[PDB]
C-alpha cells in the first residue's frame, strides 16, 4: 500500500519548499495531497507563483490520517499555519498517532504555536531560530536536516531536496530515496 | 530599470525547474512573466503540480522583448516547447537580438528543434544528451551549468538553483547573485 502525504498550502508559502517535496515525494511513489488551508482556490505563494491545490484542507482532513504531514515555510505561510485551528487539530492527531511531522524554514514555528513535539531537537532557517526557541521548548540544531522523535525539520529552500529525500527515506526506505535521488543531478 | 524574464510554461514542464528559477529571479528583483504556452489556463506539470500562469504566451509576446527567455525541462514539457511555432518565433527573435536564452534538463532539446544557437557548448540532463547531440550541432558539456555565446544550459532539478543564480548573475551581476544566494541555505 502506498504511503500518503498531506502538504498544507497557505497564502505566502515558499513555493520552492512546497513544490520540491511534492514532486520528489511523487517520484518516490507517495500519494501526495496538496491541501489548501483557505479552501479549494488557487494559492498565491511568497514569490507570487500561484498553485492550485488538489483539495481544500477541510476535505483532505476527511481522507486522513496520513503517513506524513508537511509544513512548508515562507514566513507569511508559516504564520497562517500557526494561526489555524484546523492545522492545530491535524498536527495533534498526527502526534497522538506517532506519525511523521515534517517542517521547513519558518514552517517549524507552527509546531511551537500548536505546542507540538516539545523537547525535540529541531532546526529552522537561521532567521527563524529566535522565534522557534522562545521558551526553550526545543533543542536547536544547525544540521541541514534534523530528525528527533516524530519531528523532521530543515532549514531553507536550499535544503529542500535533502528534506524531501529524508521524508522519502522515512516512508519508503533508503534504497527508494537513493533511486529517486540519482536522476535529479544533485551535488 | 529592472531586467525582465519570460518563462515559458507548457504541459508536462518539470515544476521544480519552473518554480526555482521563477522564485530566485524574483528574489533578484527581476520582473518575471510565467507565460502559458497553451493559453491563460492553469498548467499541469510533470508531477501534477498545477500552476496558474501570469499570462498566455500570446499576450506575453506582445510585451517583449525580454532580457532572458527561460525554457524549463520535463521531457513532455520540452517536447511541447519543441513543437511550438510560437516558441520558435520567440527564440529566433531573442537570438537575433543577442539576448540570453536559458534552458534546463531536456529544455535544451527545444533549441535543437528550433535551430537555435548551433555551435554552442551545451549541457542537458544525461538522458537528453543523445537527443540534443543528434547531428553534432552543439558541443556537449558535463558541467552543471554551461554558458556559451547566447546560450545558458543546465542539467536537472538538482542544478536548478545553480542555473537560476547563473541567470541572475548574467542579468544583475555577481554581487546580487551572491546576496540572493546566502539566505537560501544552499550547500
Ligand atoms: C524561509 O523560506 C522562511 O520560511 N523564512 C525565510 C526567510 C526569512 C529567509 C529565507 C528563507 C526563508
Ligand atoms: C528533466 O527534468 C528532463 O527534462 N528530463 C528528465 C529526465 C528524463 C529525468 C530526470 C530529470 C529530467
Ligand atoms: Cl519568507
Ligand atoms: Cl521528465
Describe, in plain words, how this protein is organized in 3D:
- The structure is a homodimer of 187-residue chains.
- Chain A is α/β, with parallel strands linked by helices.
- The first copy, chain A, has one domain: Class I glutamine amidotransferase (GATase) domain (Rossmann fold, 3-Layer(aba) Sandwich), CATH 3.40.50.880.
- Chain A has helices spanning 15-27, 57-62, 75-83, 85-96, 108-113, 129-132, 160-172, 174-181, and strands at residues 4-9, 31-36, 43-44, 50-52, 55-56, 68-71, 100-104, 121-122, 139-140, 145-148, 151-154.
- In chain A, strands 5-2-1-6-7-11-10 form a 7-stranded mixed β-sheet, sandwiched between helices.
- In chain A, α1 packs parallel to α7 (160-172) and α7 (160-172) packs antiparallel against α8.
- Chains A and B meet through α1 and β4 of A and α1 and β4 of B.
- The structure holds 7-methyl-1~{H}-indole-2,3-dione (72S) (2 copies) and chloride ion (2 copies).
Order of helices and strands of chain A: EHEEEEHEHHEHEHEEEHH
Subunit organisation of the chains: homodimer
Can you give the helix content of chain A as a percent range? 25-40%
Compute the CA-based radius of gyration of chain A.
Answer: 15 Å
CATH topology value of chain A: Rossmann fold
Bound molecules: 7-methyl-1~{H}-indole-2,3-dione, chloride ion
User: Helix segment count of chain A?
Assistant: 8
- How many beta-strand segments of chain A? 11
Count of spatially separate domains of chain A: 1
> Helices and strands of chain A: which structural class?
alpha/beta
Provide a compact summary of the structure.
Chain A is α/β, with parallel strands linked by helices and 187 residues long. The first copy, chain A, has helices at 15-27, 57-62, 75-83, 85-96, 108-113, 129-132, 160-172, 174-181; strands spanning 4-9, 31-36, 43-44, 50-52, 55-56, 68-71, 100-104, 121-122, 139-140, 145-148, 151-154.
